[PDB]
């Protein structure tokens, strides 16, 4: 409805306290009896609101839907993001982001419940079902030379890992350069792209897909043995609005780190985090395909690999399989 969001906003801003139909009706400037329709609807949409007589309304729990109104609260308190955009379904949050960044310098992010044409690295299909995962592109505006994309990718990786870790009983590791794993289920994939030129970057557009609320039965086939959600490694229910909040919090931390520190400082931690050593790796390079071993990550973000034929390579990027 026309007013739904503003209602949800007031409801949210007012926790841990109740507020009266009355009090809402004065703010939004609409009938006491319209606020009831709006509420009776929000509940029907799966909202948990406690309504008690004489006292009013308290927002208890939100469903697995993103609401522009409440996501406005995050953008508001943010010291990073100007605005956000929220859709229930779009073609792709990266495509949207790439459109929205032109002729302005805003930092911002875009969430969508469902993607109908979401892609990953190399333009692989990316599965993005309604109400199941956080599908989001983020735009930032670092003031750096274009060479520095690679580092961003590494820092953010730890942001996305921690955010996810704080919610997982099992250990969450990073599979360089782009994937986040819990055990041998890929929980999230992310991708960093830039608009840039000869001297200075115009924007960064990091697209992030994390699987939130998936049962084993939801995946297939046969990805079911190398894909896992967050929920499947957390005894208690996973709150999408709570995860968002830490994810954004960590994305920020790691952005600033990126902005003020050379990699070396992060390096040793990134190692503790990676699950690529002491196992055979499966590298692809256009027509060519080979095996090899991850030996080390050097100070510049590059991966030092020993291919099965004994030769040493120093790689900026790669796509790797277990």
Ligand X SMILES: O=C(O)CCCC[C@@H]1SC[C@@H]2NC(=O)N[C@@H]21
User: Is 287 a residue that touches a second copy (CB under 8 A)?
Assistant: no
Min dist CB 264 to a second copy, Å, is 20
Binding partner of 275, given a second copy, ligand X, none, CB within 5-8 angstroms per partner class: none
User: Is 91 a residue that touches a second copy (CB under 8 A)?
Assistant: yes
User: Is 95 a residue that touches a second copy (CB under 8 A)?
Assistant: yes
Nearer to ligand X, 98 or 306 (CB): 98
Long-range residue pairs from 5-11, CB within 8 A, at least 24 positions apart, any chain: 5/67, 5/68, 5/69, 5/72, 6/69, 7/35, 7/38, 7/39, 7/42, 7/69, 8/42, 8/47, 8/59, 8/67, 8/69, 8/70, 9/69, 9/70, 9/72, 9/73, 11/49, 11/57, 11/58, 11/59
Cα separation, 238 vs 234, in Å, equals 7
Dihedral over alpha carbons 36, 58, 84, 215 (to 10 degrees): -100
Min dist CB 248 to a second copy, Å, is 23
Name the CA radius of gyration of the chain, rounded.
Answer: 22
Binding partner of 202, given ligand X, a second copy, none, CB within 5-8 angstroms per partner class: a second copy
| Cα dist from 71 to 17, 45, 181, 188, 240, whole Å | 20, 17, 27, 22, 11
Nearer to ligand X, 24 or 180 (CB): 180
For ligand X, which stretch binds (CB under 6 A), given 11-19, 116-124, 225-233, 282-290? 116-124
Cα separation, 263 vs 300, in Å, equals 7
Q: Binders of a second copy: how many residues, by CB under 8 A?
A: 29
Give the SS3 label for residue 86. strand
User: Is 102 a residue that touches a second copy (CB under 8 A)?
Assistant: yes
Binding partner of 113, given a second copy, ligand X, none, CB within 5-8 angstroms per partner class: none
User: Is 202 a residue that touches a second copy (CB under 8 A)?
Assistant: yes
Using CB under 6 A, which of 177, 179, 185, 244 touches ligand X? 179
Report the site for a second copy in 121-150 (rule: CB under 8 A): 121-122, 146, 149-150
Binding partner of 126, given ligand X, a second copy, none, CB within 5-8 angstroms per partner class: ligand X
Cα separation, 249 vs 10, in Å, equals 23
CB atoms within 10 A of CB 52: 9
Nearer to a second copy, 154 or 188 (CB): 154
CA 58, chain centre distance (Å): 28
Contact 10, 22 (CB under 8 A): no
Site string for ligand X, 198-237 (x = CB under 6 A): ---------xxx----------------------------
Rule CB under 8 A: which residues touch a second copy? 91-92, 95, 98-99, 102-103, 117, 121-122, 146, 149-150, 153, 177, 191-200, 202, 316-317, 319
Which positions lie near ligand X, rule CB under 6 A? 92-94, 118-121, 124, 126, 128, 135-137, 178-179, 189-191, 207-209
């Amino acid at each position: 409805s026309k007013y739904s969001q503003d209602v949800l906003q007031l409801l949210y801003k007012n926790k841990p306290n109740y507020i009266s139909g009355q009090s809402i009706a004065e703010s939004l400037n609409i009938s006491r009896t319209a606020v009831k329709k709006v509420i009776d609807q929000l509940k029907l949409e799966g909202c948990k609101i406690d309504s008690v007589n004489h006292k009013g309304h308290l927002l208890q729990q939100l469903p697995d839907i993103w609401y522009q109104g409440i996501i406005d609260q995050y953008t508001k308190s943010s010291a990073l993001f100007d605005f956000s955009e929220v859709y229930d379904s779009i073609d792709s949050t990266q495509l949207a982001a790439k459109k929205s960044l032109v002729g302005n310098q805003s930092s911002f992010f875009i969430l969508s419940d469902e993607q109908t044409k979401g892609r990953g690295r190399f333009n692989r299909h990316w599965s993005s079902s309604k109400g199941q995962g956080l599908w989001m592109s983020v735009v930032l505006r670092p003031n750096v030379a274009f060479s520095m994309i690679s580092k961003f990718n590494l820092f953010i990786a730890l942001g996305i890992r921690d955010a996810i870790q704080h919610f997982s009983q099992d250990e969450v590791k990073v599979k360089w350069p782009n994937d986040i794993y819990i055990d041998n289920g890929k929980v999230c994939g992310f991708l960093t792209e830039m608009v840039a030129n000869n001297d200075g970057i115009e924007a960064i557009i990091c697209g992030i897909g994390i699987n939130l609320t998936q049962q084993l039965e939801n995946f297939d086939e046969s990805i079911r043995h190398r894909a896992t959600s967050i929920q499947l490694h957390d005894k208690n229910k996973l709150d999408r609005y709570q995860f968002l909040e830490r994810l954004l919090q960590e994305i920020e931390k790691r952005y600033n780190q990126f902005l003020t520190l050379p990699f070396s400082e992060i390096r040793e931690e990134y190692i503790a985090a990676s699950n690529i050593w002491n196992r055979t790796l499966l590298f692809t390079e256009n027509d060519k395909q080979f095996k090899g071993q991850a030996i080390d990550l050097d100070y510049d973000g590059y991966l030092i690999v020993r291919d099965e034929a004994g030769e040493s390579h120093r790689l900026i990027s790669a796509d790797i399989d277990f």
